[PDB]
């Protein structure tokens, strides 16, 4: 059955979190929407994007290339809805700003605003890691911007603990 | 409000689990019952017992000594209901077998049977650690024996992951 989220911790009335691998979650949860932490060219070469793409047996990359052929690059802060392949009904590819290449961190709000087009989502934090935002800040922008139901997966235990303790204690 | 368990993962219809510190859980959850992993003399010198006792500012040990003065030692597989102090309404002190001193592992069933006198409990796994049972086995005895609602706290992340993956995958 769809949207079978298990073992999440409520942070706010619409934001939940779990220490988990987003690919394993997608396969068990069968979400309506899984969010990808994308770049503007939808080149799924590492991180969450690479893991999602590999789990789709590269079908996500083939589809993404066809989308770029029609669209050109996405905007920073923008998104597109593509197939969820074997992971979800839909994949919402969202581009957060990459502060390490001089992009504007305020566009993280625009990135998360895209989640409001979907009633429930399985998602990673956006713009952290190689994109240079602080995960604590990214969680805050999510909490302040998303009003639909978001189930966040955080792979790293120490980071998960930092996010939860700082948020709730 | 009481029994405010958050972020647990359902293993069976009545057994739930979380990677958490049982003392921190008791203070946040305000459970009707917290289970102590006790010995027959209710000497709370280490492990969960020492942590619970320290959180009660030693009131648990004072009360326990008074109980032993009246009762003598508990039986292996037995229990007693004492105050929950500042952690819970009640503390169910349960003695699992210590296989390392030649006690009978089958009395782990008797230990968990005591949970059926309580509609909901916050509890640790019994008889593992210094008592020498395998945690995976202890979880199984819990699942097979307890029919009331049990919320298990496992402090160690690697052990938690082993327990959950082996149970559900
Ligand atoms: Cl929760
Ligand atoms: Cl669950």
From Swiss-Prot, chains A, B:
Q: Describe regulators of its activity.
A: Inhibited in vitro by GRL-0617.
**Where is this protein localized, as stated in its record?**
Host endoplasmic reticulum membrane
The catalysed reaction is: Thiol-dependent hydrolysis of ester, thioester, amide, peptide and isopeptide bonds formed by the C-terminal Gly of ubiquitin (a 76-residue protein attached to proteins as an intracellular targeting signal)
Note the effect listed for residue 165 to L.
Answer: In strain: Gamma/P.1
Residues in Macro domain copies: 2-169
Membrane protein topology class: Multi-pass membrane protein
Q: Per its database record, what is this protein's job?
A: Responsible for the cleavages located at the N-terminus of the replicase polyprotein. Participates together with nsp4 in the assembly of virally-induced cytoplasmic double-membrane vesicles necessary for viral replication. Antagonizes innate immune induction of type I interferon by blocking the phosphorylation, dimerization and subsequent nuclear translocation of host IRF3. Also prevents host NF-kappa-B signaling. In addition, PL-PRO possesses a deubiquitinating/deISGylating activity and processes both 'Lys-48'- and 'Lys-63'-linked polyubiquitin chains from cellular substrates.
Its quaternary structure? May form homohexamers. Interacts with N protein.
List the protein's name.
Answer: Papain-like protease nsp3
- Could you tell me which species this protein originates from? Severe acute respiratory syndrome coronavirus 2
Question: In terms of the whole protein, what range is present?
Answer: 1024 to 1192 of 4405
């Amino acid at each position: 059955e769809v949207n079978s989220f298990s073992g999440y911790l409520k942070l706010t009335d619409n934001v939940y979190i779990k220490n988990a691998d987003i690919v394993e979650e997608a396969k068990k949860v069968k979400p309506t929407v899984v969010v990808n932490a994308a770049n503007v060219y939808l080149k799924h070469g590492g991180g969450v994007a690479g893991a999602l793409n590999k789990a789709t047996n590269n079908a996500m990359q083939v589809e993404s290339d066809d989308y770029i052929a029609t669209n050109g690059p996405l905007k920073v802060g923008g998104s597109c809805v593509l197939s969820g392949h074997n992971l979800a009904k839909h994949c919402l590819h969202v581009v957060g700003p990459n502060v390490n290449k001089g992009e504007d961190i305020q566009l993280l709000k625009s990135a998360y605003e895209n989640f409001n087009q979907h009633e429930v989502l399985l998602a990673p934090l956006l713009s952290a890691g190689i994109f240079g935002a602080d995960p604590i800040h990214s969680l805050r922008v999510c909490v302040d911007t998303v009003r639909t139901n978001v189930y966040l997966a955080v792979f790293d235990k120490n980071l998960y603990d930092k996010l939860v303790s700082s948020f709730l204690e």
